[PDB]
Subunit: 544 residues, 2 copies
């Protein structure tokens, strides 16, 4: 277990300070002048890297395709936001800006501006990628290496008849001046029956090739930038594309105080317990990825087919029994509302969680208020893509004590990895795990890691009964990968799992439960849990 | 290549206590008249998971306070009581840590359990001082063992009268171990060296007849053993600390003269720059006085004013061939002239004019570049006389290789670009601060013997960012020097040699993270950011051993 994976890119290694927000800088650069500079960095030879073709044009394209073409789909890492000695031709145009133009944006925009310089009208560009501080056989091969990037066979036979022309130029030679049967790993586009059926219509109708490479290039660029609220700069198009998982714009007045209070009192006052709401408000926000920032709470998609039908969000009678009630509350507050105000369901799926915690914490030792920032919208069914969310499904979720079949790594490295995707830190991991276990959020309400005694109460009893050494941890009586805490008198008292006992058997993490497991550190744990919960609920709020 | 992760060890992100946490305002409210009455109960209480030898966890606490504070390697300063972690038996102390959890770090609890175990057996020790903050996580021939224990107690810097009093120490808890060794002349495996080895048998044989100078010797040895990795005596919190000066702490006299106000600092830094001394001398002297710090041991630093004393003014890196003799002479004269004709009762010490000279040097340098920047300076340093320096113990502070001044000694275990990383880690610096310090020192002029190895500017004695601008420019080409002396040189496009780099800055120009952290400062219209960051880093470095003496 290497906890260094959690605190990657600290503010200590950031030379720009903690007061430097990228979104407030990149909106001040005139892209009508930057594009008149990258148009001069090329067509200007250098001694150390000669070109002598009149352009560093077909080299900037191969520096965006070879940099934003390493986007793995199964875990989302790599890609844009994440040649090496050749990105110094661009120094004579980054030094004029410095902090206002990160290296990733500069590389990719140089690629796009080259593509626009060679006589092509690209679909559009959006800035915002903040930079961190750290032979049919060949046909099936290129098909598979373009499937780890999630591009269908019409957007991978248009990239290859694309960035190899630098549009009826690559074609009209490929089975044009037909070969003598003796090129490269290409030429697959004429022999493979899958590609040959599409990359032959374009030979006589190029009009549907230009505006297919155009929108297959504005997918290799803005693939891992997230929802369309980070596309800064004035170049972004005014059009919605399906692969961004769009959400409708706010067309209704939001809710202020004296209305949030009414909603989070009504949620308490109708049926739903404390271990139901915190299981729905977490399921709808445990499908986020810090890299390739897609998913998250927003959209209100936990009511929709690709995500209400997963296994972790157990639909056996739990999830569909709470979506019906929240939907019922939504219609009652949407009629005779206190004004011209309506509430999107993507709030009650989270505003339920805050009222659930405020019902538990107020019942354990003391009352609090959980921050909740409205401004979420519900996306209809036609706007989702049930094929691209099969990769968001967590094969193993460590917070809800889920362990599905087909696990590469052991049961705790997956918890560590997931807590990295949510961009969490070790104290936040520990406090959030404790809160989820004590509150009650385990998959199918297993009494595993339920070290408290009274359910539905936000105590720190998970961190107190784990450390008490009077109990003994013997896997032997059990059968599967679960433990069992025999009391000092021999009677079984608790139960555990590989995800819970790791907090009391790893000296790097056992030092992070003694902070919350003390005697006078009850209020600190509650405040830290509410802070972590608020941070997790607000992982997909880029408008604010 | 390099491992930049060592620089940002223990970030505030992994700290569950928040950035508003100081472990100097809480551990002072610990009622150590009640914590001892709790450790004294955890001892005499058996447990099922760990039975107690004779029903007393007395000895086990001592040999757990030794196996924790007995790994203080001195050749690099790391290790010791202050951080790094019988953890299977450390949980026996949970029923005490849980009552506080916040006011009592684990290191303090372990070492205090050891001390109170000693005090519970009928032995009054010297004293205890809290304050070890918690970094969270990252046959028996004389030649057989009597030399091994001598050498493994020499990496800890304990003489042979405080290592034959620790081994007649944690074998009794004031003498019955000795009544046995010399009560029988029979012939107790790695010990009994004290009966055969002529060096040890010279002193131990004497403690038989006078078994009272062993008690105080063991008291001093134990106090030194557990309070060696806490630095100067102003971190010793808690009421238990004794009021007595010990020579191995490198003590500094208390402030007996009222300090300087803002009306006098202006006059002083309007005099240092107004008498002879250039900008390349004052910066070198201030850096040399404040580059002898060890953040893993907290001993050294600017305070004490020891750069005028024998073990410091005679090193090789602080080259005394005209540098550290024409400077100390002038600063001392300014000190005496401002002291005699003082405005009032104010009287400045000398450990200021070494540093206040540096801040005036930077204020004079970053004023011909164009800016106007005032450097923070917090007075309160005192000068330590000659009789309190222990020249035998500063030979370990000797920088075998200082990367900020292009010093390169002999017998370096690692290449020249790792010694710089180790030095920057010892000073508790971060990567941007290390980079900006390197750039500022090269441009200002601080290199050992004023070698133009790294001076990439053309108008030196001026705080520009020209080190970060001429390094990134790729019109020049880097090639090893034909003389093959571990250097480099940069030809222009024509052929004439323009610069002369070294192995300590071309790593900045050829790594992958350092290149980004240089492009941050090497841009255009990013000079004010560089000047602000350099002044901040300089102020942080000057105030390393000033924060924890105040």
């Amino acid at each position: 277990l290497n906890l260094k994976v959690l605190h990657q890119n600290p503010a200590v290694a950031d030379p720009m300070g903690a007061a430097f927000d990228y979104a407030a800088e990149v909106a001040t650069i005139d892209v009508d002048a930057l594009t008149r500079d990258i148009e001069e960095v090329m067509t200007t030879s250098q001694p150390w890297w000669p070109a002598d073709y009149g352009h560093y044009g077909p080299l900037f394209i191969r520096m965006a395709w070879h940099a934003a073409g390493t986007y793995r789909i199964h875990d989302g890492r790599g890609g844009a936001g994440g040649l090496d000695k050749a990105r110094r031709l661009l120094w004579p145009v980054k030094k004029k800006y410095g902090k206002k133009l990160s290296w990733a944006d500069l590389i990719v925009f140089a690629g796009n501006c080259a593509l626009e310089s060679m006589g092509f009208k690209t679909f559009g560009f959006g800035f915002g990628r903040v930079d961190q501080w750290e032979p049919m056989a060949a046909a099936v091969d290129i098909r598979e290496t373009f499937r780890r990037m999630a591009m269908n066979d019409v957007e991978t036979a248009a990239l290859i008849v694309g960035g190899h022309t630098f549009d009826n130029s690559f074609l009209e030679i490929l089975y044009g001046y037909e070969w003598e049967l003796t090129l490269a790993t290409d030429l697959s586009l004429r022999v493979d029956p899958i590609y040959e059926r599409i990359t032959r219509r374009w030979l006589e109708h190029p009009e549907e090739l230009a505006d297919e490479f155009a929108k297959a290039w504005y997918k290799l660029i803005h693939r891992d930038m997230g929802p369309v609220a980070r596309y800064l700069g004035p170049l972004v198009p005014k059009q919605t594309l399906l692969w961004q998982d769009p959400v409708p714009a706010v067309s209704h007045d939001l809710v202020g105080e004296a209305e949030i209070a009414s909603l989070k009192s009504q949620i308490r006052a109708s049926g739903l317990t404390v271990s139901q709401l915190v299981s729905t408000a977490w399921a709808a926000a445990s499908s986020f990825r810090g890299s390739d920032k897609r998913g998250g709470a927003n959209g209100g998609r936990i009511r929709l087919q690709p995500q209400v039908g997963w296994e972790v969000n157990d639909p056996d009678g739990d999830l569909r029994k709470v979506i019906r009630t929240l939907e019922e509350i939504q219609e009652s507050f949407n009629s005779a509302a206190p004004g011209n105000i309506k509430v999107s369901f993507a709030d009650l799926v989270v505003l339920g969680g805050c009222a659930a915690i405020e019902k538990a914490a107020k019942a354990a030792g003391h009352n609090i208020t959980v921050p909740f920032t409205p401004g979420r919208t519900d996306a209809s069914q036609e706007q989702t893509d049930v094929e691209s969310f099969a990769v968001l499904e967590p094969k193993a979720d460590g917070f809800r004590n889920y362990l599905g079949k087909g696990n590469p790594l052991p049961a705790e490295y997956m918890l560590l990895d997931k807590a990295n995707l949510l961009t969490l830190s070790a104290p936040e991991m520990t406090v959030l795990v404790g809160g989820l276990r004590v509150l009650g959020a385990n998959y199918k309400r297993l009494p595993l890691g339920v070290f408290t005694e009274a359910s539905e109460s936000l105590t720190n009893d998970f961190f107190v009964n784990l450390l008490d050494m009077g109990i003994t941890w013997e896997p032997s009586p059990a059968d599967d990968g679960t433990y069992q805490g025999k009391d000092g008198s021999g009677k079984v008292k608790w139960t555990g799992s590989r995800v819970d006992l790791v907090f009391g058997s790893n000296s790097e993490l056992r030092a992070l439960v003694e902070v919350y497991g003390a005697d006078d550190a009850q209020p600190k744990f509650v405040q830290d849990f509410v802070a972590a919960w608020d941070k997790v609920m607000n992982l997909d709020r880029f408008d604010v």
